[PDB]
C-alpha cells in the first residue's frame, strides 16, 4: 500500500499527473537476438516528510535500463489537430532517456517510468522466467516483484532491409558543444553521434556536408560553416580533401554503407547557391550568386570528377551515393527547379539523384526520376507504380498519417514499419536527427528547454537525440518506438522469406480488418502486437 | 474582433493554460522615481492555418517591456502543501523574463503575457495619459487600445533601508559558460551579474569567495575552485591578492556597500575546513583536515590581519564586512559549533560575525549572538527582544510564511516587505541567487530545463536569475515581484520619517484588519495596494 | 460582441470575474446519470442598453437554471485557511431559478446558467449535444458548442447512505404567514418534503412530535409546531391527527426513515421541550427540570402509544431514529447522565443517536450511536466504531468538508469519496431551512440575510430558499453535493463488481494518497478522473 508500481504497455506515454493502464502479463516470445522491451511506472503513495524514497532495481537476466524524463513543449500541435492527439496545450511530455546508474527515486504526488530492454543474443534458445524486483533501499523490504515468462526461439532475428537517413547537422554540434569546425574534440563528438545513428537509430545512409547544406536557412543568413571540401584562394580551382577523408573513415568505421550529398541549390525554389568559402574565408557562392550563374557551372564541372574519385578512394562507389539538387519543390517553383537542373543535368550522369517532393508532375515531367514522397501524398505514386519509392514526414504531415510528435500516440510512430512493408517502400527519410536551431536557423536553441524550434514546429519534429554533457548522444522514446516499428518490418520481411509475400499481405490485412493505408490505419494499436506475435510464432514453429 | 487582450494584476501568474482576470483601469499615483508596473495577457481567437499572428506594441511613454517565459518544474512543492499553492504537480510555470526586441507573437490555443514598466525618474510632476496599443502587423489594424491615467507627485521616492544578500556562485558561472577561473571573459560575466544584483535585485551585500565557499557540497566532494586568495607553496605563508583586488573593484563600481565572507568551517557539523589549495594545485585544507587542526588555526592567524588590511584598501572597513562561522547548526551539531567557535573566537574580536539558525537555543547559549532566523521561526526571538535581527527563507519554509516558489502566489513573495517593516527586521538573506547545480553539487544542471536542483528542491528555490547567452543575467518574475515588496517597505519607511513609527504601524494594522505576522497575514492581496496608495497620497500631500 | 464559455461545474462564477473555460472532452454516463454543465456569459459590446436578450436551445432535453448572486455579511468564521475563495462581505453565487424566458447578457458583469441533461430516457449509444445561443434582436447565432455523450447500457444505481438535513416547520409558518397547521401550510410542507427526498437525496426526516428543543435561547419559545396534541388534564389523552397527516405526506414523498427530536434541552439537557396541551397550558419547558418525575411519567405514557401510531403509518422500530440530547463534554457530561438515566429503560430496543466529538463517551457506552463532527473522526476510526455517522456545521471551519458560500465547491463534493473511503454509514446536517437569527430571536429574510443575522458563515443555516409560489428553490450548494453523492454511488456500484480493496486501491492511486477528512488532495481534477475510470469499468463489464 506504500507504492504503486506496475508494468505498462511500451506504447503508453506516462504523464506525471495521470495513472496509466497496467499491462496484463502474458508469455512473450522473441527471436534469438530480438530484445524484450517493457516499461515500468511507479510512485510512492505513503505521505511522509521526504519528497521521494530510494529503490533498488534487480533483474534475473541482464537488462539495460533508462529513466523516462518529462520535457517541455510550447507548441505541441499545428492548427486544427485531429482526434489522435493526446494533448493540445503547452505542458510536459515524456521523451528523453537517461541511463539508470543508481537507485530509482520514487516520488509522492507524481508518476515516473523506466524503459527496460532485455538483450537475447547471448541466450541459448529455450524457456526463461524474468523476475523484476524493487527493494526499498532504506528498509530492505521488497516492494515490487513480477515474473514475466520469456521464450527465446531457435530462429535468429534478421535486421530490416530499408534505406534510412535522418539528416545530420554538424553545425548544431559545433554550436551546442562550443567547438570550431573541425577540432579533434569535435571529431570525437561526431564519431559518437555517427555510432548512435548507425547502431541505435538504424541508419545505413548519412548526410555529408561537402559544403554547408543549403537547408533550413533564412534568405540572406548563414549557418556555422562546416564544409568538408576546402578550396584554396585562386581562380584555377584547387581542393583540399583532408576533412572529407577523415569524415568517410569515421562513417565506414561507424558502419555507414551509403553517403548522401547535400542539395546543390537553395531550398524551396532553387534560386541561389550554397554558402561556399575558400580557406581565407572569402565567400564564393551563397544567396548573392543565383543557381544559373555560369561561375557555379564551372565550379561544379571542376569539382564533380575529382570528388567522386575521392569518395571511391574511401570505399563509396557511385552505387553507394545519393545526390540532391534542391529540396521540397511544388508547382510554384517548377521552373526554378527546371532551370537549375538544366545547369547540371549533363554533369550528374549515371549518379542516383533524389529529391523530396509531393507533386507527381515532377516525376512524369521527369524533372525528379527518383522521388522521396510525403507520407500524405503517396497515392498518385502508387497508382503510377514508381520504383524505387521513398517516404518522409515533417512538421507539415499533421493529419491521418504517421509522425513522431510529442502530442501524438507512440502508435502513430510505430505503425510506419508495417506500412513501409505493406506498400513496398524502399526508403525512409527525416530532416531532423539533431536540429538544435530556431526555424530558419535565426539562432541556436537549448534542446532540453525548447523542443518546438522556437515556437514554429510541433514538438518532437526537429531532433531525435539530445546532446549529453559527456559529448555522447542521449536516446529518445521516439527513437525507441521507431525501433519497434523497424523490428515489425524486419519480422515481416523474414516471414516473406519463408512463405509468400502474398501470405504476409493476407496476414497483415486480416489482423488489421482492412488494407492499412498510410492515411487510414486502424484506430486501435493492439493489432500490431498481434501481427508481430503471429509472425514470430510461424518462424519459430518452423526452425531447426 | 479576433484577438483577446487585457491588462492583468502584477500579482497574477498567467498560465499558458487559462485566461486570467482583467485589471480594472484606475488612476495610478506614483512618487517621482517610482515605476508604474503593468502586465498584459494575449491570445488570438481566430482559428486560421498559421499558429500565430505578429502584433506590434506602442506606448505613449517610454516602457521597458519583457515577454514572460513558461519554465518547467518536476518538483513544484515539498510534502503536504497548504492551500495557498496554485498548482501542485509537474507542469510549466511563468518565470523567465526576456527583453522584447521585436513584434509579439499571439498564438491560437494558448495565453501569453508581457511585463511592462514605465520609468518615472525623468517625468516632471503632473498628470499623464499612458496609452498602450497593439497593431496587427499583417493588416496594419489596431486590435487593442487602453489608456491608464498616471499622476506623478512632486514628492520623490526614497530607496528602501535594509541589508539584503542573495548568495552568489562563481563556480556556477564558470561551469555554465565554460570559462576557467579566472579568465577575462569570466570577469566581464561576473561584472554583469554583480550589476544586476545591486541595481535590479536591490542587494547591498555580496558573498565574496576568499576561498571556495564550504556550502552545498557532499562530504568528500569538490566544486570548481574559485578562491580569490592564492597561496604560494611553503610554510611561512605568502599570499596573492590579485583576484581579490579585481573582485572588490567590480563590487565597488557596481555599488555594493558591504561584502560577506564565507564560513570558516564546513556546513552543518562544522567538522572540517574549506577546500583551499596553493598555486601548484596542492590541497592545504579540505574534508581531510578537521576544524580543530592547529595548522588551520595557524593559517587564519596569518590570513586575517593581512586580508582586513587589503579589503580596507578596496574600501571595505571592519564595519562594512560580515563574517560566517558555519552554516545551519542544529541541536545535535551544537558541540561541533562550540569546538570550532573556540578555535577562532579570539581572532574575530570587533568583527561582525553572523550565522543562520532556526533553533532559538543557540541564541539562549550566547553561541550565536547575531542570528539570521528562519521566517517560520521568528516568534521566540522577537519575544526575547533580539536586535539586530535578520531573516531568511529556503526549501524548508513550506507553510504559512513568505517564499518565492514557482507554485506559490506572487503575493506570498511581495508581502515580505510589509512584514520586515512591521516587525523591525533589519536584513534579509537568501542562499540562491544563481545556483546552477544539483543538490549537494554532485553535478551541474541546465537552469532553463531544470528548476528544482535535480528533483530535490521546490522550483524557484535555487536561483533568482538565469544565464543569458550574451553572458548577461536574465530577470525573473520572482525578482520583479519582490522589488514591489521592497517598494512597499520604502514608502512605509518614508512615511515613518514624516509621522512616527506608531502612526505607520497603526495604518498597516487597520488596513490589514489585524497585526500581520510572518505565519499569519491577510488572505487577499488587495490590502497591500490600498496601503501603498494611502502612504503615497499622504506623502504627496505633505510636499 | 459577446463572451460565452462552458465552465467547470465546480467553478463559482462571480459577477466581477471571468472564470476559466472547460475544454470539451467526450462525456460518458451510466444510463440514468445526468450530464451537468455550467455556462457563463457577458456582453462585450458597449451600446446604450444595459443588456441584450439571448435564446438558448439544446439538441437534447435540458433542465436549465439561472445562478443568482446572493449577499453575505459574514463569509467566514475567525482565522480562515487558504481554501477560502473570498473572506469579506460581498455577493456569492448560490440561488438557482428556473429558466422561463430569454437570457439577459449584460455589459461589465458575468452571469451563469446551470444545465442538466436527463438520461433515463435515452437508449444507450453515442449522442451529439449541441448548445446554442441566438441574439433575439438580430436572429443570428452568437455561440455554438457540441459536447459528445456516450450513454452506457449499464444502469446508474442510487447511493447507499442515511442522510437527514434537519427540517423547521416554524420557518415555513413564519415566512409564508400560516399558523400551524392550515391547509395551505400542509401543502407547502409537502412541496418541501418532495424536494428533500428527490432533489436533496434524504432518506430520513426530522418529525416534530413536539417543538424541537433546538436553537432556542434559554427561557424562550419558537412557534409551537407539535403534531402530538394533548387534551387538558392529568390522566394523559393524545390526539394524533397532525402526526398522521405528516406521516402520510412523508411516505408519499418517498421517506423510508423518520427522525424524532431530542428529549431534553440543548447544551446540558437541564430541562424539557416546550410542550402544551390543547388549551395552550404549558406542561413542559424551560421551567421543568429534566429530572422532574412528571416528564418520565409523561414519556412512559406517550412512547408505547406513539410507536403504535408510527407503525400504522408504516414506520417500525427499525425505521426510526431517536435523540436524547447533543454534545456531552466535561461540562455537560454530569447532567447528560442524569437525564439519560431518567429515560434509558424506555428507549431499549430503539435506535438512539446523538452528536459526539469525544470518543471516551462512545467507549463508556454513554452514547452508543455517535454522529461525529467531520473534524473529529480520527479517534473513532481508530477504535473501529460502527455504525458511524458524520456531520459538519458552523464550527468545522478548517481542513474539512463544508458547504459555505466562501469555500470551494470542491470542499462540498469531496465528501462523497471520503464517506466511501472511511465506511461512514450516514451524513447529518442541521440546516435544511433555518430562516431565523441565531437562537431563534427573530425571523430573517433568506434572500437578504444568509448568515443567521451575522452569526454563522453564509451557507450554513439553509440549503433551500422559499419560492413565492410555496415551492422550494434549489441551490448550487445542493447541486454540488448531488455530484458528491453521485461519486459515492458509482464507487459502491463498482465495489459490487470488484471488492472494497480493489475500489480503495483505485481511490488511493488516483488521488496519489489515502484521502482523509482533514487531508485531501489540493486540486479537484482527481475526482473527475476517478469517476470516469469507475464508469468505464462498469460499462465494460455489462453484457
Numbering used by the authors:
A (entry chain D): 1 to 544
B (entry chain C): 1 to 543
C (entry chain B): 2 to 544
Published text:
Beta-N-acetylgalactosaminidases (β-NGAs) hydrolyze the different β-GalNAc linkages of various glycans to modulate the length, combination, and abundance of glycans. Despite low sequence similarity, the crystal structures of these enzymes demonstrate that all enzymes share a prototype structure and have diversified their substrate specificities (oligosaccharide-releasing, oligosaccharide/monosaccharide-releasing, and monosaccharide-releasing) through the accumulation of mutations and insertional amino acid sequences. The overall structure of these enzymes is similar to that of CpNga123 and BvGH123, which consist of a β-sandwich domain at the N-terminus and a (β/α)8-barrel domain encompassing the catalytic region. Among Groups 1–4 and GH123, the DE motif is located at the same position, suggesting that these enzymes adopt the substrate-assisted catalysis reported for GH123 MR-β-NGAs.
